[PDB]
Design a protein around this ligand. Structure first.
Ligand SMILES: Cc1cc2nc3c(=O)[nH]c(=O)nc-3n(C[C@H](O)[C@H](O)[C@H](O)COP(=O)(O)OP(=O)(O)OC[C@H]3O[C@@H](n4cnc5c(N)ncnc54)[C@H](O)[C@@H]3O)c2cc1C
Ligand SMILES: NC(=O)c1ccc[n+]([C@@H]2O[C@H](COP(=O)([O-])OP(=O)(O)OC[C@H]3O[C@@H](n4cnc5c(N)ncnc54)[C@H](OP(=O)(O)O)[C@@H]3O)[C@@H](O)[C@H]2O)c1
Length: 295
């Protein structure tokens, strides 16, 4: 019983922004915002791992109304206030140089979202998605591999697993498994949710492990920027040991470029033991224990 499309793109939920809080500390690169919306009055229900569409105001270059952009939900089903009245997103402002013009360009929806004021009414659709759901089993193991805003669904899992108010609100889900987050961002001030992630590891050293790939402050053994797949390769044998456990789920969220390198580290470790990764991975997919959301 997973609710999907309670509000469709043609008839979105309209809710007010409650707050818009900066996640990149001083010295960091660009802007990433934690935005929380009010759902009271409507009936938008959601669970961890799902996404929502935001429809920004305006029309594109062709005179057509702007389409929805999808964003991973960043709060648990209860919302950040733990009262079932809200929903949060974790949004990067898109900013780039035009290939042949040199001008600074900004994305439409991510600029709209990152500069939104509390009290603004926003078009919301969904929730959508069944690919990234957490298992109900409190004895599952959870491997999370995340670049940038890819942390968003991981935040829904981790908070559900480890937040005081969440543990008090979910008596049927007291997590006892092993949890491992590998998180790739460019700088320390760019570590989204740093303090809260570090708080979790301190309180649950046996249930949660936190590994960073800080791409501009750390180098991989081969001279390059420290990326996710370099952390993966570094712990490849242990991770493969853990993936072989039938209770283990793996979640990948962020850049598609992280996948090729993850498969190569694991293909190597799995071959040491006479197992062809790509076929085993095929089975994991079918059994629904390999979860991928790249964009
Ligand atoms: C499943 C899913 C989940 C997502 N979750 C999140 C999330 O949690 N947080 C988040 O911030 N985003 C997330 N996104 C991405 C998000 O949906 C938007 O795509 C993003 O915010 C940019 O939208 P925009 O409207 O700001 O940019 P737009 O105005 O739509 O512009 C994007 C277009 O800009 C062009 N572009 C980009 N770079 C260049 C370049 N270098 N040179 C020339 N053109 C370029 C491309 O044509 C691209 O299609 C997710 C996407 C998907 C599909
Ligand atoms: N990471 C994502 O979730 C994602 C998804 C789609 C698009 N993007 C692009 O990145 C911009 C910012 O993204 P955002 O804040 O989520 O992420 P952001 O903080 O940049 O974090 C992305 C991390 O991925 C690293 N990285 C770059 N190329 C990689 C590769 N091939 N394999 C593994 N890791 C790699 C980046 O390192 P360096 O920059 O130091 O190389 C950085 O540490 C977006 O506006 C978009 O242009 C990112």
């Amino acid at each position: 019983d997973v609710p999907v499309n309670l509000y469709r793109p043609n008839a979105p939920f309209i809710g007010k922004v409650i707050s818009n809080e900066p996640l990149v500390k001083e010295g960091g690169i660009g802007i990433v915002q934690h935005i929380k919306f009010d759902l009271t009055g409507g009936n938008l229900k959601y669970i961890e791992g799902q996404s929502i569409g935001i429809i920004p105001p305006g029309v594109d270059k062709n005179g057509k109304p702007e389409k929805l952009r999808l964003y991973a939900i960043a709060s648990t089903r209860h919302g950040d206030d733990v009262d079932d009245k809200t929903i949060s997103l974790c949004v990067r402002q898109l900013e780039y140089k035009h290939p042949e013009s040199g001008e600074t360009v900004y994305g439409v929806c991510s600029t709209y979202l990152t500069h939104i004021e509390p009290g603004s009414e926003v078009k919301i659709t969904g929730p959508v998605g069944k690919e990234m759901l957490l298992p109900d089993d409190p004895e599952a193991n959870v491997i999370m591999l995340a670049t940038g805003t890819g942390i968003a669904p991981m935040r829904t899992y981790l908070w559900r697993m480890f937040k005081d108010a969440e543990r008090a609100a979910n008596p049927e889900y007291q997590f006892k498994g092993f949890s491992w987050l590998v998180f790739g961002v460019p700088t320390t001030p760019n570590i989204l949710y740093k303090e809260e992630l570090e708080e979790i590891q301190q309180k649950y050293p046996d249930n949660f492990r936190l590994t960073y790939a800080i791409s501009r402050e750390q180098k991989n053994p081969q001279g390059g920027r420290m990326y996710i797949q370099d952390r993966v390769a570094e712990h490849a044998d242990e991770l493969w040991q853990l993936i072989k456990n039938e209770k283990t789920h793996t979640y990948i969220c962020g850049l598609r470029g992280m996948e090729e390198g993850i498969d190569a580290a694991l293909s190597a470790a799995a071959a040491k033991e006479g197992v062809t990764w790509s076929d085993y991975q095929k089975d994991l997919k079918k059994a629904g224990r390999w979860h991928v959301e790249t964009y």
